[PDB]
Every structure is written in structure tokens, then in C-alpha cells.
Write a protein that binds this DNA or RNA. Structure first.
Ligand SMILES: [Mn+2]
Ligand SMILES: [Mn+2]
Ligand SMILES: [Mn+2]
Ligand SMILES: [Mn+2]
Ligand SMILES: [Mn+2]
Ligand SMILES: [Mn+2]
Ligand code: NA
Length: 325
DNA sequence: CGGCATACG
DNA sequence: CGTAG
DNA sequence: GCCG
């Protein structure tokens, strides 16, 4: 088992679901306390289990696996022996965890804002609604639409959104293309948001495109909220006899950068952090969603595909459906 | 022990 | 500070 | 919390 998640296939569904979910509770709780290091370790240990070819049945099977030390191994041992881990259950039913999770899941609210609200005694969404004076425009939108935004987005929803985005993009710039990214590109059947990457085959024609796209969507009455190259919107998606709010991200990249932006926006989050860590620490190259930089020769690697990028990093190619780290 | 990814709005 | 993957 |  390789030590970096970008070195191993990770499918969407796997053979250690319960174990990985428990470790990801502890990872999330570490984040709510600001312990980014512990969050990462628990996230990586969870992802190792997702990559295994069969169920862990015995503690012996953890020996030699990367990111399993005393703590993550104890968690697994208790779940193997009792079907529950007392630490995990204590986190689950703690008022701190429940409230931080409820608050941070609001669009516009991060750990730091949720933490300050928690320290102020706030616990519920209606607590936040009673003092709108204390909210940003973005948070007011996230709270107004919170119920819809908590409802799973389905693939049928995605196909309808993509057609309307393509129609606005085609008017903004003939020849521009729309690619579905994020978790749907990794094969998920449901999601909590939809992500699109927009480019044009003639380098430079994409400049100025996103304002033109947004203005057209707004004029069609489709934009419930928006605020450049990245747009974090809330779309009005028609539904049987009604509609629902859906989070949509629209991103523009020049075709020279498109492989890097595709790679980054396709995720997963952990996969991209691990890929960039691997790039820098093992290969001495600096990766982001714009490009891959050699800091010794001071040159950018030209890529025509994701396959190019994996090759330039010395990694076996992984299709999106195996990047579910 | 230091590191933990790296951007944009 | 928020957002993204 | 774990790795190197
Ligand atoms: Mn026991
Ligand atoms: Mn997404
Ligand atoms: Mn998104
Ligand atoms: Mn840019
Ligand atoms: Mn230390
Ligand atoms: Mn970037
Ligand atoms: Na949030």
C-alpha cells in the first residue's frame, strides 16, 4: 500500500465503509477544533481503508498500512470487537460537534465563524435567523436556502443544469465548452452541489467570459444568489410543479490550463492535497489548478490532458472514478 | 522535530 | 473572513 | 496523528 493517496486507486464504493466513516468523524471533529494535522492523518487513514481490496476483519491486517498508528488502530480494534468506538460515539452526541457541523454546513460559514457563534451561546439556525444584523449577504443566502441545499442533487438534476449552462455559455461565447467536474465526474450518483469547467479552444478567447455567462443566467431568472474566474452561485432548478435551490460552481480556464483545472476541480479534496504534496515533496514540482512549475529550471509543464500530468509526475494514470480518496 | 496543498472571491 | 477541489 |  503506497503512502500517498494519489498512488493508489480509490473507488467510490468499497469494503470498509463503516471503519472509514468512523475515522472520518474523528477527522471532522479535529477540524472543528483547528487541529489540521490530526484531521489529515484521520482522513488519510480512512482513505487507506477505502483502497483495500477486501474487508478488514482482524487487527493484524492493519500492520504495515500507512497512517495507522496507536490511535487509528485502536479505533478499528474497538469497532471490530464491539461494533462501536466509544470515542467516536462521544463525538457524535456532543453538543459541540453537532452544532459545529450544523453551522459549518451553512454556505458562508466556516469553522472560525461557527466557533465564534458557538462561544456566543448560539446553537440553532433559528438562533442565527433572530439576529440577521450579524450575517453577511452570503450567509443570509445560505440560511434562506439551507433546507434545499441540504437535499441531495440527483443526476437528472445535473443534466438539466448542464443544458441551461451550455445555452448561456453558447450565447456568451460561441465555441466555448462546458465540462461537468467535481463528485459527479468521479461517478457519484448524488451530490450536494454541481461543478462546471468552461473553456474555449482558442487560447485567450475565454477572457472576460464569466461575467457574460452570469449576466445571461441572471437575465433568465435562474440565479438566486451570486457574488473573475470562479462563481459560487445558487441556481433555481425547476422541479415537478415547483423548483429548488441548488449550489452550482462555474469556473473558467484558458485551454492551456484546462487539464490542470479539470484535475483540480475533479478532486477529491484529499486526492488533490495528496497529489500536490507528492508533487512537491517527492518530485520537487509545484502543482495547482493552473499548472505545474519546475522551480529549478523556472518552467511550466505544458499539458494537453490529465494523462500528461500523471506522466510528468511519474504516477500511474487514475481515471476520475478511482480518485475517490 | 517540522510538515501537513494551494489557489480565488 | 468566505469559497473550491 | 502520523511519517520520514
Ligand atoms: Mn474492548
Ligand atoms: Mn462539488
Ligand atoms: Mn461545488
Ligand atoms: Mn487564474
Ligand atoms: Mn512537532
Ligand atoms: Mn489554483
Ligand atoms: Na460553510
Amino acid at each position: 500500500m503506497p503512502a500517498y493517496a494519489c498512488q493508489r486507486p480509490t473507488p467510490l464504493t468499497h469494503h470498509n465503509t463503516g471503519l472509514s466513516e468512523a475515522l472520518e468523524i474523528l477527522a471532522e471533529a479535529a477540524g472543528f477544533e483547528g487541529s489540521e494535522g490530526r484531521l489529515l492523518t484521520f482522513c488519510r487513514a480512512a482513505s487507506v481503508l477505502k483502497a483495500l481490496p477486501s474487508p478488514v476483519t482482524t487487527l493484524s491486517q492493519l500492520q504495515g498500512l500507512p497512517h495507522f498508528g496507536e490511535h487509528s488502530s485502536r479505533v478499528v480494534q474497538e469497532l471490530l470487537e464491539h461494533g462501536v468506538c466509544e470515542e467516536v460515539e462521544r463525538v457524535r452526541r456532543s453538543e459541540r460537534y453537532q452544532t459545529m457541523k450544523l453551522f459549518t454546513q451553512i454556505f458562508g460559514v466556516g469553522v472560525k465563524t461557527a466557533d465564534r457563534w458557538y462561544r456566543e451561546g448560539l446553537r440553532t439556525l433559528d438562533d442565527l435567523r433572530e439576529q440577521p444584523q450579524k450575517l453577511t449577504q452570503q450567509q443570509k443566502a445560505g440560511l434562506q436556502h439551507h433546507q434545499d441545499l441540504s437535499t441531495p442533487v440527483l443526476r437528472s438534476d445535473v443534466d438539466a443544469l448542464q443544458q441551461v449552462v451550455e445555452e448561456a455559455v453558447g450565447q456568451a461565447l460561441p465555441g466555448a465548452t462546458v465540462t461537468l467536474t467535481g463528485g459527479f465526474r468521479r461517478g457519484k450518483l448524488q451530490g450536494h452541489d454541481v461543478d462546471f469547467l468552461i473553456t474555449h479552444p482558442k487560447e485567450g478567447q475565454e477572457a472576460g467570459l464569466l461575467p457574460r455567462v452570469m449576466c445571461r443566467l441572471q437575465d433568465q431568472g435562474l440565479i438566486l444568489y451570486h457574488q473573475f474566474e470562479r462563481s459560487f452561485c445558487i441556481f433555481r432548478l425547476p422541479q415537478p410543479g415547483s423548483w429548488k435551490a441548488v449550489r452550482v460552481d462555474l469556473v473558467v480556464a484558458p485551454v492551456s490550463q484546462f487539464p490542470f483545472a479539470l484535475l483540480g476541480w475533479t478532486g477529491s479534496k484529499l486526492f488533490q492535497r495528496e497529489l500536490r504534496r507528492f508533487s512537491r515533496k517527492e518530485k520537487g514540482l509545484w502543482l495547482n489548478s493552473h499548472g505545474l512549475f519546475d522551480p529549478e529550471q523556472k518552467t511550466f509543464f505544458q499539458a494537453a490532458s490529465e494523462e500528461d500530468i500523471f506522466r510528468h509526475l511519474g504516477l500511474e494514470y487514475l481515471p476520475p472514478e478511482q480518485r475517490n480518496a
